[PDB]
């Protein structure tokens, strides 16, 4: 059992052509670059049959024209090993000690010279010898891991737990990293991980009490929100403290919640970290919250969210100072082996796309594992980049504890069954080297088992409760009754004047200057448009002293060239952000931050959700270029935004701004899928709205921000109505009107006793129907608008209908096809809530498989037909 190729027999060759010193230097470079391909990193003696084996002919002395006859000759090595001269025997020895034992490293692809040299120096110095105290501490942690698993196996046989057996070195690795961070003087560590070994991490790393875990197994679950539904035990989070064992340091540790969908926690936990860093506010030399992110091998290589999130690491609005990644490589999926899971040689090969180091380490050598953890944390602190650790281990049982792995992997499980554990091997080693006594070794085991037995008995004394029905979360938060959302006239003029206080030598671009002038004049003359209404809202909130953050694709200028939140000087390329300046000059320390995102919907929306969870007192908004591209973030919508409160008791106030409208641009630029969002709504989970005037948009946003109802808000925003002159607002609407309106009654009804038809509408189609009514002089019709779709304002709708006593019909008019838009929701729910209402009649486009037509002439024909049908 020796791992190297034996020395071969050959004749001595002459020192001609390429000199032999040159050849020895090439051998050194080869080992530094490709030595990991023959390192002792696999605990099993296993090669997967279907996988290609890389060429490693570069690592034998024959390929560099050297021979056994050169082993005792001396050569110039140019500072290798801190020496100017050396023999080939000593060169080989050192290279093999550094690059071919229990740690394999990839770092030569890095472009910066100082980085490379830092890593090179530390790897060739070697792992320092630990003290006896340190060694005993590692043994305690290994014991705790294995003991916990065995206890649960004994007391609860069939139950699903996803064990960590085969990979117990994870516990001392994570502990090493957290301990190093505490020594550096940082503030917090945030963890995200999957199912494998979660209960073990909760107990041994975070410090969740043992009584809680046992209760979970007996069927008593802790409640997150009153009347909540809940979730399985391996999807929950917690908080705790960590004290340094051989130091005076202390750090906070947290673990976040997540669904079954693998790798969906990656963008969410990045956002949490960024929000926490922003709150502490320590500048560029800060970055004092550390992200620690665990993965599995099959998921890491397969799912595309992983590289998508790593791509945000060095960008202006997303940087968090680097992430420490750990891949638990147990060499198997569920019943699938690496030959069917990836086309890369290693699972961690995405690192080479981003220019980051990789360390592969054997999971049966605990001292090496602890060293690698420390080295990774130090690299992050110095260089501020991502680092990747690959922990090579195995899975002792099946995927779960009810499965038989021999059916599909017979040969692999001949090697696994009947091995001795990592705890056993390490205990044997220490006793052998005289580093530990037998009395000590036995006490370590006995003490921990006594602790667990004690707690278990205490838990079983208390009787088991019986099941009870879950009520719901509808009334678990209060509504802001009697809150006023108007600003003063002084405040409105100051906001307007922010676009005139340009810096010293700044000028606007010729096509932007008219927009700025209109903003200064409108706050006293009238004609405020949609975009200026939105900015007035965010600006007012920033003045009061809040952190406002807006992010999305092309969101600084706007997709429709309407926002201009940051302006650029054509001559010098200087930037200017008016509202941020004004906020910072009022002494409440408010901020207005605007960012252009990368081209992602899954990672984009995920990051913003996380930001909302990490700072409860911030105002966050994500924008989509068109609302049609939001289906690329469906996982986030379904698993976090819509259902997080009911499952885990995690609350959020994220705002989604989704453009919407039927205007003839085709099937992927028309519909944000209102029907889909209205399906997800129940128990008052989130608010859904589609306002028709800038002032109403203003009032909706401000109500959300100033209330104490912590639930999301989804707004369907316009595209062509942005520049419609009939939709503009007057200043009195921002300063004298006090509240948001959920239903707006018809403002052009002469006599209410002559009305015989009522039309209900939502959004931009109002302005077409009103136009036609005026032209044809109809005094028997009344158009009523619905601004808030969910929850249903049935009291106001009832009040409006009651104002027209001679009405005979009610028409529901929408632009969308009959199987889309708000009609399906309303035809089901509204008749029950208003019993005395006449039967409703739909007027819309026909039902379709696609969203809209692709021909523009057909769109125009359809619209004419629709409005004609509405007016008999």
Ligand X SMILES: CC1=C(CCOP(=O)(O)OP(=O)(O)O)S[C@H]([C@](O)(CCC(=O)O)P(=O)(O)O)N1Cc1cnc(C)nc1N
Q: Which of 101, 103, 116, 89 has its CA nearest to residue 29?
A: 116
Residue listed under structure tokens 């601004």: 787
Answer yes or no: is 586 a known binding residue. Answer: no
Selected from 441, 727, 792, 840, the binder of ligand ACO by CB under 6 A is: 792
> What's the CA gap between 149 and 154, in Å, rounded?
9
Answer yes or no: is 343 a known binding residue. Answer: no
Answer yes or no: is 669 a known binding residue. Answer: yes
Nearer to its own copies, 572 or 748 (CB): 572
Q: Between residue 208 and residue 227, which ones bind its own copies under the rule CB under 8 A?
A: 219, 221
List residues bridging with 296 in a β-sheet. Answer: 328
Answer yes or no whether residue 327 interacts with ligand X by CB under 6 A: no
328, 196 in Cβ contact below 8 A? yes
Answer yes or no whether residue 117 interacts with its own copies by CB under 8 A: no
Sequence-distant (≥ 6) Cβ neighbours of residue 571 within 8 angstroms: 507
| Binding-site partner at residue 196 among its own copies, Mg ion, ligand X, none, CB < 5 to 8 Å by type | ligand X
Q: Between residue 662 and residue 721, which ones bind ligand ACO under the rule CB under 6 A?
A: 684, 687, 703, 707, 709, 711
List residues bridging with 238 in a β-sheet. Answer: 255
> What's the CA gap between 308 and 601, in Å, rounded?
10
Alpha-helical runs (H) found in 164-207: 170-184, 198-201
> What's the CA gap between 171 and 178, in Å, rounded?
11
What are the structure tokens assigned to 287, written together? 């970055």
Q: Between residue 445 and residue 504, which ones bind its own copies under the rule CB under 8 A?
A: 466-470, 472-473
Answer yes or no: is 330 a known binding residue. Answer: yes
As a whole number of Å, the CA-based R_g of the chain is 33
> What's the CA gap between 322 and 670, in Å, rounded?
39
Nearer to its own copies, 185 or 854 (CB): 854
> What's the CA gap between 867 and 662, in Å, rounded?
14
Q: What is the dihedral of CA 391, 111, 309, 184, to 10 degrees?
A: 60
| Binding-site partner at residue 330 among its own copies, ligand ACO, Mg ion, none, CB < 5 to 8 Å by type | Mg ion
Answer yes or no whether residue 481 interacts with ligand ACO by CB under 6 A: yes
> What's the CA gap between 320 and 189, in Å, rounded?
12
Nearer to its own copies, 172 or 228 (CB): 228
Selected from 118, 162, 576, 794, the binder of ligand ACO by CB under 6 A is: 794
Alpha-helical runs (H) found in 384-416: 412-416
Q: Between residue 276 and residue 305, which ones bind its own copies under the rule CB under 8 A?
A: 298-299, 301-305
| Binding-site partner at residue 344 among Mg ion, its own copies, ligand ACO, none, CB < 5 to 8 Å by type | its own copies
46, 331 in Cβ contact below 8 A? yes
Q: Which of 850, 793, 796 has its CA nearest to residue 826?
A: 793
Q: Between residue 590 and residue 619, which ones bind ligand X under the rule CB under 6 A?
A: 599
Cβ density class 685-718: b for 16+ within 10 Å, e for less:
bbbbbbbbbbbbbbbbbbbbbebeeebbbbbbbb
Answer yes or no whether residue 263 interacts with Mg ion by CB under 5 A: no
Answer yes or no: is 298 a known binding residue. Answer: yes
Q: Between residue 533 and residue 562, which ones bind its own copies under the rule CB under 8 A?
A: 553-554, 556-557, 561
| Binding-site partner at residue 632 among Mg ion, ligand X, ligand ACO, none, CB < 5 to 8 Å by type | ligand X
Distance from chain centroid for Cα 368: 31
List residues bridging with 757 in a β-sheet. Answer: 781, 809
Q: Between residue 733 and residue 762, which ones bind ligand ACO under the rule CB under 6 A?
A: 739, 742
CB 665, min distance to ligand X, A: 8
Only segment of 76-84, 164-172, 650-658, 726-734 that touches its own copies (CB under 8 A): 76-84
Q: Between residue 795 and residue 824, which ones bind ligand ACO under the rule CB under 6 A?
A: 795-796
Answer yes or no whether residue 226 interacts with ligand ACO by CB under 6 A: no
Tell me phi and psi for residue 392, to 5 degrees.
-90, 120
Selected from 297, 386, 623, 639, the binder of Mg ion by CB under 5 A is: 297
Answer yes or no whether residue 673 interacts with ligand X by CB under 6 A: no
Binding residues for acetyl-CoA: 687, 703, 739, 742, 796
Binding residue numbers for thiamine diphosphate: 196, 260, 262, 297-299, 330
Residue numbers in the known binding site for Mg(2+) are 297, 330, 332
Binding residues for 2-oxoglutarate: 235, 260, 669
Question: Which residues form the interface with ligand ACO (CB under 6 A)?
Answer: 474, 479-482, 684, 687, 703, 707, 709, 711, 739, 742, 791-796
Binding stretches for ligand X (CB under 6 A): 194-196, 260-262, 296-299, 330, 332-334, 399, 553, 599, 625-626, 629, 632
């Amino acid at each position: 059992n020796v791992p190297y190729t034996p020395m071969r027999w050959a004749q001595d060759v002459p020192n001609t052509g390429v000199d032999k010193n040159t050849r020895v230097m090439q051998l050194i470079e080869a080992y530094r670059s490709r030595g990991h391909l023959i390192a002792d990193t696999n605990p099993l003696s296993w090669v997967q049959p279907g996988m290609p084996v890389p060429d490693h002919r570069d690592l034998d002395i024959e390929t560099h024209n050297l021979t056994i006859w050169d082993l005792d000759r001396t050569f110039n090595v140019g500072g290798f090993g801190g020496k100017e001269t050396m023999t080939l025997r000593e060169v080989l020895s050192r290279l093999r000690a550094a690059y071919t034992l229990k740690v394999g490293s990839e770092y030569t692809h890095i472009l910066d010279r100082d980085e490379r040299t830092w890593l090179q120096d530390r790897l060739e110095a070697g792992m320092p010898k630990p003290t006896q105290a340190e060694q005993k501490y590692i043994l305690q942690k290994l014991n705790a891991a294995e003991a916990f698993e065995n206890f649960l196996q004994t007391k609860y046989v069939g139950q699903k737990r996803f064990s960590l057996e085969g990979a117990e070195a994870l516990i001392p690795l994570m502990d090493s990293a957290i301990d190093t961070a505490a020594g550096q003087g940082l503030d917090e560590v945030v963890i995200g991980m999957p199912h494998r070994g979660r209960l073990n991490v909760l107990f041994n790393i975070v410090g969740k009490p043992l009584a809680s875990i046992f209760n979970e197994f007996e069927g008593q679950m802790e409640q997150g929100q009153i009347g909540g539904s809940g979730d399985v035990k391996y999807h929950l989070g917690s908080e705790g403290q960590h004290l340094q064992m051989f130091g005076d340091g202390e750090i906070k540790v947290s673990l976040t919640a997540n669904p079954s969908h693998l790798e969906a926690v990656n963008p969410v936990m990045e956002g949490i970290v960024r929000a926490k860093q922003d709150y502490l506010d320590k500048g560029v030399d800060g970055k004092t919250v550390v992200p620690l992110l665990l993965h599995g091998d099959a998921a890491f290589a397969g799912l595309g969210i992983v590289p998508e999130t790593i791509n945000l690491a060095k960008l202006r609005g997303y940087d968090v100072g680097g992430t420490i990644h750990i891949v638990v490589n147990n060499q198997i999926g569920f019943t699938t082996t690496p030959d069917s899971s990836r086309s890369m040689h290693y699972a961690t090969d995405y690192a080479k796309a981003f220019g980051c180091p990789v360390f592969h380490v054997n999971g049966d050598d605990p001292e090496a594992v602890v060293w690698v953890g420390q080295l990774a944390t130090e690299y992050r602190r110095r260089f501020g980049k991502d680092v990747f650790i690959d922990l090579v281990c195995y899975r002792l049982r099946g995927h779960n504890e009810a499965d038989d792995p021999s059916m599909t992997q017979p040969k692999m499980y001949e090697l696994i069954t009947g091995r001795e554990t990592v705890r056993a091997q390490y205990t044997e080693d220490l006793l052998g080297r005289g580093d530990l006594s037998n009395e000590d070794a036995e006490a370590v085991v006995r003490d921990f088992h006594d602790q667990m037995e004690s707690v278990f008995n205490e838990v079983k004394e208390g009787g088991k409760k019986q099941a009870e029905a879950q009520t719901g979360i509808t009334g678990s938060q209060k509504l802001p009754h009697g809150l006023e959302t108007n600003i003063s006239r002084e405040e409105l003029l100051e906001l307007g004047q922010a676009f005139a206080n340009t810096p010293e030598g700044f000028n606007y671009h010729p096509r932007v200057a008219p927009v700025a002038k209109k903003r200064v004049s409108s706050v006293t003359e009238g004609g405020i448009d949609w975009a200026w209404g939105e900015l007035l809202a965010f600006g007012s909130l920033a003045n009061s002293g809040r952190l406002v953050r807006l992010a999305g694709e092309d969101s600084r200028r706007g997709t429709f060239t309407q926002r201009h939140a940051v302006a650029i000087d054509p001559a010098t390329a200087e930037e200017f952000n008016p509202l941020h300046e004004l906020a910072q000059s009022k002494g409440n320390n408010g901020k207005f931050l605007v960012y252009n995102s990368a081209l992602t919907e899954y990672a984009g929306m995920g990051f913003e959700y996380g930001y909302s969870v990490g700072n409860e007192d911030s105002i966050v908004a994500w924008e989509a270029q068109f609302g049609d591209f939001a289906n690329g973030a469906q996982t986030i919508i379904d698993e976090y935004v819509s259902s997080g409160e009911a499952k885990w008791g995690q609350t959020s106030k994220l705002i989604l701004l989704l453009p919407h409208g039927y205007e003839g641009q085709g099937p992927d630029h028309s519909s944000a899928r209102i029907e889909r969002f209205l399906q997800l709504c129940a128990e008052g989970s989130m608010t859904v709205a589609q306002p028709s005037t800038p002032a109403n948009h203003f009032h909706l946003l401000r109500r959300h921000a100033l209330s104490d109802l912590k639930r999301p808000l989804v707004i369907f925003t316009p595209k062509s109505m942005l520049r419609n002159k009939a939709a503009a607002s007057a200043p009195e609407d921002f300063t004298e009107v006090t509240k948001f309106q959920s239903v707006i009654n018809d403002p052009n009804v002469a006599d209410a006793a002559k009305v015989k038809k009522v039309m209900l509408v939502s959004g931009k189609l109002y302005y077409e129907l009103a136009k036609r009514k005026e032209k044809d002089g109809r005094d028997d019709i009344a158009i009523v608008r619905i601004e808030m779709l969910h929850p249903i304002p049935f009291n106001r709708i009832s009040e409006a209908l009651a104002g027209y006593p001679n009405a005979e019909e009610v028409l529901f008019v929408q632009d969308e096809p009959a199987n889309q838009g708000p009609w399906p929701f309303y035809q089901e729910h509204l008749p029950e809530l208003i019993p005395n209402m006449p039967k409703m009649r739909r007027v819309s486009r026909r039902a379709q498989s696609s969203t809209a037509t692709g021909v523009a002439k057909v769109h125009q024909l359809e619209e004419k037909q629709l409005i004609d049908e509405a007016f008999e």
